[PDB]
Design an enzyme around this catalytic site. Structure first.
Site, mmCIF file in Angstrom:
data_model
loop_
_atom_site.group_PDB
_atom_site.id
_atom_site.type_symbol
_atom_site.label_atom_id
_atom_site.label_comp_id
_atom_site.label_asym_id
_atom_site.label_seq_id
_atom_site.Cartn_x
_atom_site.Cartn_y
_atom_site.Cartn_z
ATOM 1 N N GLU A 129 47.955 -12.420 -68.374
ATOM 2 C CA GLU A 129 47.473 -11.366 -67.599
ATOM 3 C C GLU A 129 48.636 -10.134 -68.290
ATOM 4 O O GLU A 129 48.580 -9.195 -69.162
ATOM 5 C CB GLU A 129 48.156 -11.446 -66.265
ATOM 6 C CG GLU A 129 46.772 -11.989 -65.910
ATOM 7 C CD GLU A 129 45.860 -10.852 -66.154
ATOM 8 O OE1 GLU A 129 45.152 -9.679 -66.263
ATOM 9 O OE2 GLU A 129 44.328 -11.661 -65.623
ATOM 10 N N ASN A 134 42.903 1.489 -67.743
ATOM 11 C CA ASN A 134 41.709 1.378 -68.085
ATOM 12 C C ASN A 134 41.413 2.965 -68.194
ATOM 13 O O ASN A 134 41.645 3.954 -68.155
ATOM 14 C CB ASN A 134 40.773 0.549 -66.718
ATOM 15 C CG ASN A 134 41.596 -0.835 -67.191
ATOM 16 O OD1 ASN A 134 41.240 -1.545 -67.457
ATOM 17 N ND2 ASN A 134 42.109 -1.149 -65.695
ATOM 18 N N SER A 137 41.309 3.522 -63.372
ATOM 19 C CA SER A 137 42.341 2.296 -63.061
ATOM 20 C C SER A 137 43.409 1.635 -64.139
ATOM 21 O O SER A 137 42.972 1.885 -65.155
ATOM 22 C CB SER A 137 41.618 1.512 -62.358
ATOM 23 O OG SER A 137 41.541 0.273 -63.239
ATOM 24 N N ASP A 141 40.056 -12.791 -51.020
ATOM 25 C CA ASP A 141 38.660 -11.691 -50.654
ATOM 26 C C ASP A 141 37.421 -12.672 -50.769
ATOM 27 O O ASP A 141 36.661 -12.296 -49.954
ATOM 28 C CB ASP A 141 39.123 -11.648 -51.870
ATOM 29 C CG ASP A 141 37.753 -10.194 -51.328
ATOM 30 O OD1 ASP A 141 38.107 -8.928 -51.244
ATOM 31 O OD2 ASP A 141 37.234 -10.177 -52.642
#
EC number: 3.2.1.17
Length: 129
Positions: free
Chosen positions: A35, A46, A50, A101
């Site tokens: 990452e 992005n 974002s 989540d």
């Protein structure tokens, strides 16, 4: 700041990521590696307004507030700059919320495309954790 592989591994274990929600330590060190290259200041902008921040490249759309992203939900209840610190505290705390989540580590595109199903245990090879 640029973390060492064993150095980051230890920080994560301290914060209790080993087996958190069924993901062994190796998964997290692997996810960071791909990452952000273990760079605490890594930032990616992005196409959707974002941005992905820090060592775990958490997205500002749902997890943090950077003040310029549409549909912000700010679920970690943190400013995105907290995610750019030299200490991993905020990134780890938010990551634990992402993982809970219902997507698990699948929320991280790097984990899913490069770590998932591999020998993750290699990521902590030779660490004296």
């Amino acid at each position: 700041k640029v973390f060492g592989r064993c150095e980051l591994a230890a920080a994560m274990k301290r914060h209790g990521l080993d087996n958190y929600r069924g993901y062994s330590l190796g998964n997290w060190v692997c996810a960071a590696k791909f990452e952000s290259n273990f760079n605490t200041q890594a930032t990616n902008r992005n196409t959707d307004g974002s941005t992905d921040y820090g060592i775990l490249q958490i997205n500002s759309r749902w997890w943090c507030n950077d003040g310029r992203t549409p549909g912000s939900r700010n679920l970690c209840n943190i400013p995105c700059s907290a995610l750019l610190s030299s200490d991993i505290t905020a990134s780890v705390n938010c990551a634990k919320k992402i993982v809970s989540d219902g997507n698990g580590m699948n929320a991280w595109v790097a984990w899913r495309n490069r770590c998932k199903g591999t020998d993750v245990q290699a990521w902590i090879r030779g660490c004296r954790l």
